[PDB]
Symmetry: D3
Subunit: 231 residues, 6 copies
């Protein structure tokens, strides 16, 4: 639509959703064959190509609920996208979340008002598609890549003075990022399938960072789990 | 505590959580060996007994978030209960939810204020324990019992003039019941494991009912999946 | 309906509403003549019998807004119940509320979302029926039983980390329990009459407890005021 | 304080609270002896005088929660006022509320945010002082003046496009006015006594009006009940 | 209407809106020629007269959102008032707001629920009419009267235990008063023009007061800017 | 910081804030001299260059409150940016907003929860810096470029089933976009200066579109007003 300059057919049934349009470029060129780039609108690149003879697209989302909602909306409405898989990172908020872990979000908490706007006095708990969830999980187990299944927290403010993540951590939440709630909610709304796969960028509470070498490895594992889940 | 008249040790690591204290009585006597009844307070019976040489307790919860929260709180705080497994029914709100299906709740939406009281402007999405979730799922697949994984809706009002379930159905929600949010939220809060396994009592939207014979079968499958998941 | 296995006529115009179905059993057998038990569904016993030649029923409610709402709904809708009188206990939250006092709730505050779901941005203050309120008050004065008239607080969480009762106490609130808001709101909604009569179970803030002998006496006074108000 | 130009002692233990400062002037001159006028600030007149040898003050409040809160605050804080009695009118919202009826508010619903600001996710139900309530009720019964006891609705918007009074009426609410919630809430907060006594200005829903002769009579009865309750 | 006893034509296109009906009396008699007083209802005086041969009315509002809303509603609906200009004072909440400054409100924050009632989950930011805003600003600059343009905070509680003004100050808010949000919101709603011009009554946070001589001067400047803006 | 790969000094006191990083590239190359590009992180380009010998930077923001908040935060915190000026487009929601008009936002309404998270029960009305506002306005008047001053609406959902813009239009709101509330709120919070200047992309309600030639012209006028306001 408005935000994606592609012709129908240029986008696959399955799309991967990095936040960074350069991580989109990177993924495609490193992982896929016969790459075509279908969108340059706003520099939020989308690429279609193939992986083991099966078409896969990879589309930047931007940061925040309102940005990804745009792309997820159009991908669904204008291009009949069936599987949508966020591949990104999160800030870990618990010691037991290890920097090599690969996270599969079952659900997500949020301070985005997107759902309270739709639902009023209902707390809508979004939900990953289980078939995709299990595939990814199996793909990880099969190869021995360390994986954790629980929830994340989709923030509106990266810099947030009134952050309640200390309380979210006690309730089991694994980490913070900025897209999952939007993804899971829009996909379910339109009878599509979605899943969010995440790496640990750093520990937000211990302030402790992860090295460029740790980031590259888990990144590659993430893409692997995503691609192998779709085989 | 206050609500459970038991001596420490009388309650197993794993407790099953029917809504009905008579379904508690029924489950124990039909499924377990050497049954002892540890609680008669308020007629909300709890029973400990064994299944294949492993201790399992079964404790009535009552109906509603505030009732189950009581029992889940005390079971956790006063008796160090590790696994808590709701076995109950739900009203289905989608055609694709079939009356023979067995539901495993990944998460739950609610109009209970329990979480908005704790979290303010955060929408807290509760989360099933995945290890328990997968066990139950495997137990079902192994035996060929039909199973669905998604979300339910924990209502406060059984009779609810302002029910939004028509909108919840469009977003993928499977059915309505009255306990899951409380269960999943309290268990995560205290580092314990929880899962909610449900049968389809009827279709709320199509008004269409399920027969006493359908109810008995799926009920038995539910208990099986619950017990076999714990083996 | 669904929750009460009775035939029409088996339930009186006036029903008393203990929380505990065993306190239901107890009340009936101790206070009424020719007791019939009309409901065993879920072990939430209801009993009809007579007191001085006038029919009175006594029905367990369970704990929490969502539980009592069920019974109050069905009692009203399926059995044309006119007077509904909660007889239960509360935790006192002020020094001036004395352990021998009998409380008549004029109204109730809540953190239940039941009313915000119905009303949006209106704070609905529920209201006892005054004719019943005055009767009970008179019955107490006549016999010299100590009585207090003010408000209570209907909680959702018995165990509540974010309890504001310290602020509720300053505003005059007398004590905490878990049913009144539901009772008063549903009864008014259907043009019926309701009242909540309560004993002081203990002081929540001073942590100070009440003895089994104090509980028995005030309990008996409570039933007396309830029964004599209905004479 | 800021809003009342009086010297300590100039204001009685008991104050009556009309909305209209000219109804303040009127009440005093018609009902009281040896009238002194203690406040002319902003033309919101307050008068002290006597009725049967007992001092009574009468103080205008203005319209709206935020206006009366000012006067009730200062009367309490700066002049140790013990009894505060709103004498005003309301718009009736039910057929059964008759234009000659005199209303005693047990409680009040509101769309004012005053309490949600103080309490967050608690619905605070304000509460009339029962001793004052009963006195007024008795005074009415004694003289045979028709009286009704229930709740009113304190509005913020006189002209309100999103008025929910049609729903409030079904739940038993008697009528709409603009002060009671503030009165009852501030008085309880400071351990004082308050009551709101109201006449039916008109029926808001039937659009049907009341004549100048009906208004005068019920007005006089209102003052009588107020004064006789204080005797 | 109900609240203003005037005949059509008695009220000018432009009305000034002091809070105090005696400041209404004062303004008219000091600033206008051939003064007629059109309203005495409730002692909330309105006056029409002339200033340099142009008709200007001046109408008391009372205190609080719900009070001014009444007068602004009727002035708009029953008397086709085009320009409405609040002339009042505010409590300053920042050091940089100087006691001689004259404030022009671009917008206003509030804890009034008036807008959340209308809009649900939208934060409605009210807006001054810019043409009026600029006129007033120019009038000030022309004469060298010190002027500041930013936002104020419309409070519901003058005495407010849960005041967040310390946080409002950090976000740039200039001062607190009790009417602006109502004014700006109702005027925009009906395609009319509104502006709020304010003097600094005192600094709320530094507790520091302003002398009767400072108040008189800035008051006079305020009226000047208001009148000259309308020339 | 994290999101901007620049060295201190590389970013000017004044930054322009298009949504589109390619509109950032375009603006700089067309309007500025000696352009250096300081940021390529995530392809959200920032450029510093000069306009009439004065340094001006131009930085992409992405779409949505959470995206721009990131850039506005870092620009303020890590690079001491003083003036921040959004240059973008909006969807007009009123007939009187003409496709050639240039909008200066005094304030903005939102359904973003960003402020309710910070403020609870306060409606925070953000506020443009008036000195910048007036400069831009003057720059427009001087050259005769058509300009309108009022409010806009910052949406979270571009595709929004529960859009209330029909009600926002009646209250005077000019158009919808996705950044202003974040901009104005963060800038005020840190004692900086902000303004949002917008073109009319299309009329959302009349569905009627604007041609590529209309867009180019108003775009150029927008940049002119922005640059000339800063001269």
């Amino acid at each position: 639509s408005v935000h994606i300059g592609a012709e129908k057919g240029q986008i696959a049934d399955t799309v991967l959703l990095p936040g960074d349009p350069l991580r989109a470029k990177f993924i495609a060129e490193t992982y896929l064959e016969n790459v075509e780039c279908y969108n340059e609108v706003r520099g939020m690149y989308g690429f279609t190509g193939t992986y083991k003879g099966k078409k896969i697209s990879v589309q930047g989302t931007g940061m925040g609920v309102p940005s990804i909602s745009i792309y997820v909306n159009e991908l669904i409405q204008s291009y009949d996208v069936q599987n949508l898989i966020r591949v990104g990172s999160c800030g870990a908020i618990r010691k037991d979340v290890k920097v090599r872990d690969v996270i599969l979000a079952m659900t997500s908490s949020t301070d985005s008002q997107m759902n309270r706007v739709a639902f009023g006095s209902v707390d809508f708990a979004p939900c990953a598609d289980f078939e995709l969830l299990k595939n990814a999980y199996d793909a990880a187990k099969d190869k021995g890549v360390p994986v954790t299944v629980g929830s994340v927290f989709t923030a509106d403010q990266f810099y947030n003075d009134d952050s309640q993540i200390e309380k979210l951590a006690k309730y089991g939440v694994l980490g913070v990022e900025m897209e999952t709630t939007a993804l899971y909610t829009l996909a379910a709304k339109h009878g599509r399938k979605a899943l969010s796969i995440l790496t640990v960028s750093d520990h937000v509470l211990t302030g402790e960072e992860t090295t460029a070498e740790e980031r590259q490895t888990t990144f590659h594992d993430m893409i692997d789990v995503a691609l192998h889940s779709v085989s």
